Amino acid sequence: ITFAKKIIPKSTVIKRKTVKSPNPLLQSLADFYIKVAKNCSNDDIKRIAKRLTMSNKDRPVVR
Amino acid sequence: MFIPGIFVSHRRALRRIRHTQALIKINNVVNKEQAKNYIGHVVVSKRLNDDKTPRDVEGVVIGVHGNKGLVRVKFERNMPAKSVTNVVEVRLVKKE
Amino acid sequence: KRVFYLKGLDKNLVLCAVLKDGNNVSFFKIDESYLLATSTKININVNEIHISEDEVPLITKDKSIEIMDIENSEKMTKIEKSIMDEVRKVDYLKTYLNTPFEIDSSVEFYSQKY
Amino acid sequence: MKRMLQLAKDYISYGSISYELLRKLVYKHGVIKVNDKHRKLNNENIEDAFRGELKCIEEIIHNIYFGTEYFKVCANTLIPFRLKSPQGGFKGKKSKGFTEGGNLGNHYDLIGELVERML
Amino acid sequence: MHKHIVVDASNHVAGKLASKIAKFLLEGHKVTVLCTERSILTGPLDRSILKFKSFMNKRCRVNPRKGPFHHVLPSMRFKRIIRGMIPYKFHKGKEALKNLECHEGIPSEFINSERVMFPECLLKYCNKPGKKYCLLGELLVKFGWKHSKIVKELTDSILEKEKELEKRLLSLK
Amino acid sequence: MDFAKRNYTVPPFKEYKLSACLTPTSKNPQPQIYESTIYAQNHVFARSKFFKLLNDKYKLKPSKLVLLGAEEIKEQVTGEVKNYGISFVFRCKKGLQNSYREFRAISRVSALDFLFREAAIRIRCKRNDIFVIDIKELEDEEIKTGKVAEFNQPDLKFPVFGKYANTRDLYVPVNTNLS
Amino acid sequence: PNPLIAIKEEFRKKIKFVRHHSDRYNRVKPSWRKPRGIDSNVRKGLHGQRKMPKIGYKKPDVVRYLLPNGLRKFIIHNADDLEPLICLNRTYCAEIAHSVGAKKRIAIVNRAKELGIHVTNEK
RNA sequence: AUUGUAUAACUAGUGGGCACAUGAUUGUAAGAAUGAUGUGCAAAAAGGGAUGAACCUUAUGAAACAUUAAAUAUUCUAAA
RNA sequence: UGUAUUAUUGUAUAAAAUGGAAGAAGAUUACUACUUUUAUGAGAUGUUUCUAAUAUUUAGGUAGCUGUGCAAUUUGUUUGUAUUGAAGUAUAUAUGUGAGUAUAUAUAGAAGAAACAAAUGAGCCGAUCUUG
Ligand SMILES: [Mg+2]
Ligand SMILES: [Mg+2]
Ligand SMILES: [Mg+2]
Ligand SMILES: [Mg+2]
Ligand SMILES: [Mg+2]
Ligand SMILES: [Mg+2]
Ligand SMILES: [Mg+2]
Ligand SMILES: [Mg+2]
Ligand SMILES: [Mg+2]
Ligand SMILES: [Mg+2]
Ligand SMILES: [Mg+2]
Ligand SMILES: [Mg+2]
Ligand SMILES: [Mg+2]
Ligand SMILES: [Mg+2]
Numbered sequence A: 001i002t003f004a005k006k007i008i009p010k011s012t013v014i015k016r017k018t019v020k021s022p023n024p025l026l027q028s029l030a031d032f033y034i035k036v037a038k039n040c041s042n043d044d045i046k047r048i049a050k051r052l053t054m055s056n057k058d059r060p061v062v063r
Numbered sequence B: 001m002f003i004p005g006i007f008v009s010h011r012r013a014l015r016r017i018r019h020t021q022a023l024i025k026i027n028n029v030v031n032k033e034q035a036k037n038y039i040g041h042v043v044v045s046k047r048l049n050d051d052k053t054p055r056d057v058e059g060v061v062i063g064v065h066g067n068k069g070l071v072r073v074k075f076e077r078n079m080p081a082k083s084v085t086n087v088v089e090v091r092l093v094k095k096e
Numbered sequence C: 001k002r003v004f005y006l007k008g009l010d011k012n013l014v015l016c017a018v019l020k021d022g023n024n025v026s027f028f029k030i031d032e033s034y035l036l037a038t039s040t041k042i043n044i045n046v047n048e049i050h051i052s053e054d055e056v057p058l059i060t061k062d063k064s065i066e067i068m069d070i071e072n073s074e075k076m077t078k079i080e081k082s083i084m085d086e087v088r089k090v091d092y093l094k095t096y097l098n099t100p101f102e103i104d105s106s107v108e109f110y111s112q113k114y
Numbered sequence D: 001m002k003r004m005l006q007l008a009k010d011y012i013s014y015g016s017i018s019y020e021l022l023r024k025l026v027y028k029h030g031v032i033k034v035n036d037k038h039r040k041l042n043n044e045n046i047e048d049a050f051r052g053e054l055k056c057i058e059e060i061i062h063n064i065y066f067g068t069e070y071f072k073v074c075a076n077t078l079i080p081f082r083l084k085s086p087q088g089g090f091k092g093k094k095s096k097g098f099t100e101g102g103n104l105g106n107h108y109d110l111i112g113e114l115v116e117r118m119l
Numbered sequence E: 001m002h003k004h005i006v007v008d009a010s011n012h013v014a015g016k017l018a019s020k021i022a023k024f025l026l027e028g029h030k031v032t033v034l035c036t037e038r039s040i041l042t043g044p045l046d047r048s049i050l051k052f053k054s055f056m057n058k059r060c061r062v063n064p065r066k067g068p069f070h071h072v073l074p075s076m077r078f079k080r081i082i083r084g085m086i087p088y089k090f091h092k093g094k095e096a097l098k099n100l101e102c103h104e105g106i107p108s109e110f111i112n113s114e115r116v117m118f119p120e121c122l123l124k125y126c127n128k129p130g131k132k133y134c135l136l137g138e139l140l141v142k143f144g145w146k147h148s149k150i151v152k153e154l155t156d157s158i159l160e161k162e163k164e165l166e167k168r169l170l171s172l173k
Numbered sequence F: 001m002d003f004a005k006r007n008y009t010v011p012p013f014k015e016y017k018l019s020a021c022l023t024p025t026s027k028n029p030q031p032q033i034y035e036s037t038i039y040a041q042n043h044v045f046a047r048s049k050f051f052k053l054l055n056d057k058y059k060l061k062p063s064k065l066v067l068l069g070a071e072e073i074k075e076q077v078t079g080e081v082k083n084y085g086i087s088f089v090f091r092c093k094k095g096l097q098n099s100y101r102e103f104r105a106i107s108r109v110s111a112l113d114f115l116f117r118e119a120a121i122r123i124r125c126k127r128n129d130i131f132v133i134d135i136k137e138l139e140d141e142e143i144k145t146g147k148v149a150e151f152n153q154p155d156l157k158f159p160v161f162g163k164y165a166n167t168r169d170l171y172v173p174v175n176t177n178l179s
Numbered sequence G: 001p002n003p004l005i006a007i008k009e010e011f012r013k014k015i016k017f018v019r020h021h022s023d024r025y026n027r028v029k030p031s032w033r034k035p036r037g038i039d040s041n042v043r044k045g046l047h048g049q050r051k052m053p054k055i056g057y058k059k060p061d062v063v064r065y066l067l068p069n070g071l072r073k074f075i076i077h078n079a080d081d082l083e084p085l086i087c088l089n090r091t092y093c094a095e096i097a098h099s100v101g102a103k104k105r106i107a108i109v110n111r112a113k114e115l116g117i118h119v120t121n122e123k
Numbered sequence H: 001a002u003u004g005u006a007u008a009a010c011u012a013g014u015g016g017g018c019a020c021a022u023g024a025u026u027g028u029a030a031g032a033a034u035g036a037u038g039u040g041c042a043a044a045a046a047g048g049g050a051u052g053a054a055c056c057u058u059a060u061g062a063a064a065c066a067u068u069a070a071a072u073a074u075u076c077u078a079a080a
Numbered sequence I: 001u002g003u004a005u006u007a008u009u010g011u012a013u014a015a016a017a018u019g020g021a022a023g024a025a026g027a028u029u030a031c032u033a034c035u036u037u038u039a040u041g042a043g044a045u046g047u048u049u050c051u052a053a054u055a056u057u058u059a060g061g062u063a064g065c066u067g068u069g070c071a072a073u074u075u076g077u078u079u080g081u082a083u084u085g086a087a088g089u090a091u092a093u094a095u096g097u098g099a100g101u102a103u104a105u106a107u108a109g110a111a112g113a114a115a116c117a118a119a120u121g122a123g124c125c126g127a128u129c130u131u132g
Helices: A024-037 A043-051 C074-083 D002-007 D019-028 D045-050 D058-065 D071-076 D112-118 E014-025 E045-055 E074-082 E091-099 E150-161 E165-172 F043-057 F108-122 F146-151 G004-008 G104-115
Strands: B003-012 B017-026 B041-048 B054-065 B070-074 B087-094 C004-008 C014-017 E004-008 E030-034 E040-042 E100-102 E133-135 F014-022 F033-040 F065-067 F082-091 F096-105 F130-137 G072-076 G092-096
Touching: A024 A043, B017 B087, D019 D058, D019 D112, D058 D071, E014 E030, E014 E074, E014 E091, E074 E100, E091 E100, F014 F043, F014 F108, F033 F043, F043 F065, F082 F108, F096 F108, F096 F146, F108 F130, G092 G104
Parallel strands: E004 E030, E030 E100, G072 G092
Antiparallel strands: B003 B017, B003 B087, B017 B070, B041 B054, B041 B087, B054 B070, C004 C014, E040 E133, F014 F033, F014 F065, F082 F096, F082 F130
């Protein structure tokens, strides 16, 4: 008899609350999606809130 | 109403001194079993002032120490350690 | 000095009566912890004695406090004949309350029965 | 498990206690795990530990004694106990073996003398 | 509470008596020793000469004036034994040595004063019976004590010569 | 232990009756049972001593054994002094030796401890090194030592040399008699 | 009285953190520097030598920066600068800078009297 | 038994070591020279071995109270 | 009662360079051998308060790597002080874990401070360091 523990993926956890860019508009978008992602059950919204706090390299360009 | 005593030394190791607890030899107490009754008794020590008036500091017995009736006691301001072999007294009032 | 314990109050104090020079008693209040008990006892009922807190003074630890002598209550003198008769019954009790209490040397304090 | 205790005998003293002393350990020193954090071992954290199968502390002690299929899950959700120094001290030495004159090794049923003073 | 105590030193072991006195001084009392020439030293007389002869060899080679001194009198020899127990360099030990006094035999002042003995140091109750021993003043004659004869005479003469209620109960009550 | 300073009537060593056998297997179910008596302090110390004895007379490893039951034996003591003779084997520096002694005590638990006191001087070895073969009560005309034969004769009287003080105090005045 | 004054006196120390060897010469100033030698007895922390600053000595955030009166001080430069601390009358106290002249210092005390602000720096 | 595991990018210091326990080679022998396994000092506090880099108990912020280990209980020195 | 061995144990064999080392005084019940109790005694281990990215889990550290902060000189913008007395210097008091800061009294006589950003000739006990 075992019990399986729930696995939270690391692509949904958030580490940095402050963005490294000196832009005041990007800071106002970033905390809005953090405020929603705490009380949301949908997974893809949590992926957006992490992706706003990354660098320039980690979000490359898309054709 | 007071029973005389002798301040022997602080609580010691061979090379380290704990300055907060002092050892007192009470008169005519020779055992552990007789020393267990003298707990919670107020101890008054008499020391001088700067203008040579009397000054008084009081303390409460904490517990026994050894096999021959030596008794630990905790004061308000600790003993000056130059008052070795002086005389303090024990009251008959219990303090809880 | 040996003092008759009459009754306990509510202020974490007690009522007590000490003898005086000639056949005179008083009242005072001290802490319960300032006392020491002996096995000797006379019979005094608690309903005869009445209690009033303002009449009776108190005594602190420190010596240099002047205490005021309050005028003697009328209820006391009726109680005074109920206690000064009790001292005449037991043989040599007036000589017992005049002699001061002393610690004896060469013997431990908590050995005797007192 | 007995062969593992044979190799690690230089730091380990072990035995086999009774039911009454086992009941005395859990009520005094008990810490449960739920979601990788230590908790108070109430009647409500037992629910979230076992997903509602066990509802009382007395259910746990019944499963360690009579070895059942819930043995591994109940023995693992307890963190190691934390005990005091023994009242009265050790008799001989701490380094030598039990049959040699010390304390280390296998006490068979006499482990109940050492744990109660440390308890 | 500090007492004054006169001690008769006779029939005592020399080293063991000096052990109990050094704790009795460090609590702040005053003590005096009489008849220190009659203490006992265990063992044969032949080893006890060999021990003292090794003590008379230590002297400073460069300047012998600034060297270890060897006292002869049984009073001043007994003081050197008690000094080994006490921390005589600091202020704590300098005070306790100001309350010590020893004497030769029995002087004139202490004929009427009482004496005490120590039961943990008497020879009959300390050791096994039936072994050899010697006195202290018997040993120091061979090292140059000038006068062991007059003290024996004067002390022994001292040690030879010493060898209406019912009305008041009713009236006062 | 009121007058004495150590318990001389109930020593630490006791008497245990032991029994054990092998664990059953397929080739050999229901094997042989053995029994003995070893003197020790608890049953755990007596388990270790007995299993080593079974290693030497038979090839039985102690890892395969199982302990059946061990109980303690006590004797209703009356209080008469009896004679005892102990035969034993002790281990020393050079090798093993075997000897024989005769004692006088109340019970055989007590007579064993008088051997440990004598062996502390004459032999100078730890108490776990002596292996006791048997203790028996000796009747008369088997006493081979004059020390037991001197004390067995009736109506003995001999005084005592007094050398002990009767006060636990620091100092007493001179001329008080410590009788 | 204020209950915060009795809580403030529980967290006090005597330790001063004076630099090593600052008494032996007049070259070395008594401000604190950390020794970085090889044989340094102060760096290893043996008993009998000086103590070093660590983060365990830090007071809590309720008691930190508190005056003995029970308030936290603030510096004003004008007579009209008292406007932001009118509502914080019980928590904060004000004091005057050391450059204000004696004539302008009179008009500050009359304005701190009406609003109820407690001024430490006087005379 | 372990809530993570796996993968990349960039960059510093070091390359004169010594000691204890177990077992070896050369040498009459060495606080001598040279290898093998484990742990230390270097870079590690307090208590004990009178004193000592490596021996014996022993994991780490500022303090107070009780229980022990190593070692000790005539006196210096706390404790029959 | 004595001759043979075995076990335990004592003495002789045993000699050096200034006055000596069981740590010392001294000990024959403070030496040696074997057991049980009592007590003293460590950032050890328990109980309570507080500080460090709801820590009932973690916290030493040479060479070395990274983060948060204090001191000095000059530049753009905003706010303010001063002949009823600015900058400097000398003594105290409070406050900060610490680099440090703020105020009070005496002396002296003409200019200096704070916030958001910028540029560096940007913080000494040592070099048989340089000048007085
Ligand atoms: Mg122990
Ligand atoms: Mg080891
Ligand atoms: Mg190096
Ligand atoms: Mg060390
Ligand atoms: Mg040594
Ligand atoms: Mg002592
Ligand atoms: Mg203790
Ligand atoms: Mg710890
Ligand atoms: Mg601790
Ligand atoms: Mg660190
Ligand atoms: Mg430069
Ligand atoms: Mg310079
Ligand atoms: Mg430098
Ligand atoms: Mg020059």
